[PDB]
Design a protein around this ligand. Sequence first.
Ligand code: ADP
Ligand code: CL
Ligand code: CL
Ligand code: CL
Ligand code: MG
Ligand code: MG
Ligand code: MG
Length: 1286
Amino acid sequence: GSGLVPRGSHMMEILRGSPALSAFRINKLLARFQAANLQVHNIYAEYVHFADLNAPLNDSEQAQLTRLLQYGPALSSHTPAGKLLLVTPRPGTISPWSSKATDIAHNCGLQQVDRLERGVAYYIEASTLTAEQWRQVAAELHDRMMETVFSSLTDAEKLFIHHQPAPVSSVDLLGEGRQALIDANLRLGLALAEDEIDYLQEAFTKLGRNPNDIELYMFAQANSEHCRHKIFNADWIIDGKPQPKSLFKMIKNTFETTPDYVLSAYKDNAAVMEGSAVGRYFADHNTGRYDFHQEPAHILMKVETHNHPTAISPWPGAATGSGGEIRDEGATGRGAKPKAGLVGFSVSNLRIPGFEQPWEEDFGKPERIVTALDIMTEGPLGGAAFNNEFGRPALTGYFRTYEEKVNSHNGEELRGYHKPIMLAGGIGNIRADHVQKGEIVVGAKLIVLGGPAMNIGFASVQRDNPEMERRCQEVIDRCWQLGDANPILFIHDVGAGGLSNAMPELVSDGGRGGKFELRDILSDEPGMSPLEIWCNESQERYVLAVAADQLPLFDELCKRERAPYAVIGDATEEQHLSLHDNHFDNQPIDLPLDVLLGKTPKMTRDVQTLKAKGDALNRADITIADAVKRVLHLPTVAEKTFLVTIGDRTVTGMVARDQMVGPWQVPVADCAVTTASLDSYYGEAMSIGERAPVALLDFAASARLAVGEALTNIAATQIGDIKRIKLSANWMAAAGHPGEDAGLYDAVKAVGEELCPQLGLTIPVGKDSMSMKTRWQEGNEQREMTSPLSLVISAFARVEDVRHTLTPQLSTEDNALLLIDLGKGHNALGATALAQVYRQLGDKPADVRDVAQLKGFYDAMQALVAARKLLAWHDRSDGGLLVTLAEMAFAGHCGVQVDIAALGDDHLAALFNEELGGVIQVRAEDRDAVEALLAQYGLADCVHYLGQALAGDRFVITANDQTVFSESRTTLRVWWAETTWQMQRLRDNPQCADQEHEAKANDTDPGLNVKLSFDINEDIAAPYIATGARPKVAVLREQGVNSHVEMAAAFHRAGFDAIDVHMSDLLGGRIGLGNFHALVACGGFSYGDVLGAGEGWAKSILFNHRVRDEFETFFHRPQTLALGVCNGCQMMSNLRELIPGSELWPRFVRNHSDRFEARFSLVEVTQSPSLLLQGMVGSQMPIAVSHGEGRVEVRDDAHLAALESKGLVALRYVDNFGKVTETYPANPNGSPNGITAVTTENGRVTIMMPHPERVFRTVANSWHPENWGEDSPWMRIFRNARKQLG
Ligand SMILES: Nc1ncnc2c1ncn2[C@@H]1O[C@H](COP(=O)(O)OP(=O)(O)O)[C@@H](O)[C@H]1O
Ligand SMILES: [Cl-]
Ligand SMILES: [Cl-]
Ligand SMILES: [Cl-]
Ligand SMILES: [Mg+2]
Ligand SMILES: [Mg+2]
Ligand SMILES: [Mg+2]
């Protein structure tokens, strides 16, 4: 029986949940305790749930609540023993878990539930221990930045305290003079300049009234160098000479020179370029049916960083970095649709315990920040949690480690990334007449779309709820999908400054003022002051203007999606900002907009050039063999799987090229490619170029190389005209650090005024983060860790044919490998991975050697791509030619025999320079034609025949008759894997990490391979489609689901009319299942998987008796068909009681890896009654997997044997040898007997974890046999459905 006690005006129920930690996590905790000399005999942990009730539950409601709070894997339950430590969110905070779980309760009719929260009760047996050591135990069990530890369950009442609203406070300028502003500036941490203090003093003396804190806070944000970009708008004097252009004007030079294809630059959040005219697939507002709409899909692009918050709390830092950038995309124009993401990290040395590398030295860090290791453990998980749960695939990225004492521009000092680069970006699509924002009508309603606010903007500890952002995106999508009737007049993301930035910017951009009502804004924290409500940086919010007459439409759209919103003001003709408070009947803000948005003078930066003298590499301890080993262990170079498979790469159904390449799924793809629509071969490409360490020797060369590498990474994609490629430039520097300012100017000039104009590359978007350094006291000594100037270039392009992309996967057919050395034999070793791993900086770095030749290289690559003359491509970058060739051999699972005698006598420099260029593989018969073709672009003396790819395990580098380097390719491949192995091992289930790593050492692995039991080109649905009779399918979705459009598209290809059926449609009677003969429950993250993946969705059905009866009725009809995929499989497994023949079905629980798995996994189709798998039994082919809770769990061995004997298993993971497996990641989730689909006795209902709808197009299979046509094997599931309905 659960606890129930008074809690102010309410009652608080305390419910016991389930064991919270798996055995390996328990063992990890005990080992941490042993290692810190805390003698802990045992530890057990249990979730506990807290429900704050505004009215009582009856017996039935109580049983409902209890059932809602049963979820999770069925771990070993124990009777509590020893000391209780309860870990909860900090008082004053509300977990994302709380927001989601409380929505579930409400959708199951539990309106009495005011709020649910969760904690973890730890039961620690350690009968020794002093209270000092108890605080040390407690420290180990919580995150000090977001959680607190309590000694009683009943202390959870403090989480639900309701504080009375705090009033506005004035700053008494009139009563104290300027000192009041000075006091306020220090108290509120506004960081105002003297001349800003002067401006505010005058403005308010002029008005004759004291400013409120809220008005000062608002002004401080809107004027900080960041929001105002003072450095990038500054006048410069350098070495005594005035400069004619600001940094911004130099970036704009690129648009002045190359306007081509650009639709929007510097006037929104995202830049927009031309895309392709394609069939855009979405559900019509009138019919609810999914239809193709032939129109241009233009391409938006944006890249942002979130550096300081990630240094403090990396998980939410990364997660909200992604969340904010996703909102910028969605709020482009009058609404747009994010499509795919990219991710970047730069951090200091990892210093992985037990795997220290020889270049690494502990220099200490500030106590207030986390280590590089914690950033790379938790940060990628945060960014991926946002991308996965929002539903955008993350398809390209970079990850660099740098921390060294070097003799740079300011002499000998510590250079690194204690404050990291945390970068998030992406592309999206946007309609032609939404690229422009409108012109705000007077009396327009001004709306906040999204989450109830809390006091968030401890103040750098963010909080993310991606499911809220998904619900808002669905609204925005409905809006732009109305074309000319889109009701969004203007929209803007809410980010830095909260509403205090966003709403003034919304009305300003529309030439208007606003008047606002504070008490209309949705709030989860009644205590907040007007300052906190107006200025907090609570996440997942947008602001928009809608005409009064469209408000009923907007309301309907929001309610169907379950996206909260509030009309909070009206647009005024008068250009005044008014905020009123109905509670305190006063006016926290009453200001003309010109007063608020008032510029002090522009900055002048008067600076001088510092320039390091290089020092030639000391080679005394370097051999080629040792160097190969060290370089492959540099995380920058090394295999990146830990950053890739944690993130979904198939959501949308438009991913053509992800990071993982070939049958061996090696993450070496140089760029990302998406299709433009679900029915096109046109597309979009993304690449990244960065080379920060070079800036320690040469600022301008580091920038030129960033541009160059973005181009070399994208070059083997079919684009055509170089002017199609558009760049984002993100500039990270320690402004004011000696030499960095002049270097910044010179780098911006090097790209903006020189290289990009000459190549024809526009930079229509960009950002800057200008305090990339960290200071702290280490001994009695001041310490400082300062970043190199760090330009990250992201390149975006329209793609002419996604099928023609090349990867690094070498063929072993008769071939030639040719190096294109754009370094022209300079072979520079300064600031290379080679230099870094021997703790040096070296002498001269690479650089763009010849602009015409770089353009020539691009053009020549485009010609070879279009003529189908390349077998493979991989560019040269970190780790040089050696790494390029090794990675190609990894991807090809083969050997190379190369000769480097033509590349100079210095073999080390030939192999390890990081000059621009790369290796092309061509058919041996095409070698002379390819060489002549390259010669036509001026490249002859840069092109060198190296040798060939050969079947086998030999990686061999010769120079004439001398062996320069020779090793097992497998050995090198395993060395290169060691960093990801060790990361996975400390972050995930070490048993899984080890299994994955060990499989890499088996050269006999034949890679993904197929066996087909049917003809995959035979359209068995074609006779039905040809009659023109198209049966409906209910494509079912719930709040937070994300993969509903591609599911519809698969069914549509098989001849169905796909209907968009939200659970809100079933609940409002707008749709009835009695009108359908087929249903599908789609994937994604309903309710964010809170209360167990699929459970909230299922239980919202089961606890609403009418909708429940409707499902049951559907499933009991004699000819109805249903499919559940991923989240829908989870949902339907929780709905067993309504589905006949489902008694032996398992549950689907947390993966054994304890990690989200985004894999392209090999399965076989097994013999079952499943009607959707007819004709496919015995087939083996890969399929998209994307889930965290896919592990089949049975109630005991009896139930496993019964399920098996009944013959209801329909798909099983196999290894690449074709055998059923439980070894990871071949089986990605630990399901017994590889089980990942089941059917009912009648075969009419089938549920599966993988996503056949994501891979029905051959072009969307990460790897596939060359001879396939447009249809993959998985198309047959949807065709089988059509045919069965007859
Ligand atoms: N932070 C990351 N998140 C996702 N993928 C990443 C990340 N860092 C690198 N990758 C991917 O891993 C592969 C190897 O990356 P890297 O060796 O840095 O690329 P390159 O040397 O071609 O620039 C690429 O496909 C790249 O997109
Ligand atoms: Cl027990
Ligand atoms: Cl095959
Ligand atoms: Cl009802
Ligand atoms: Mg690389
Ligand atoms: Mg590359
Ligand atoms: Mg790179």
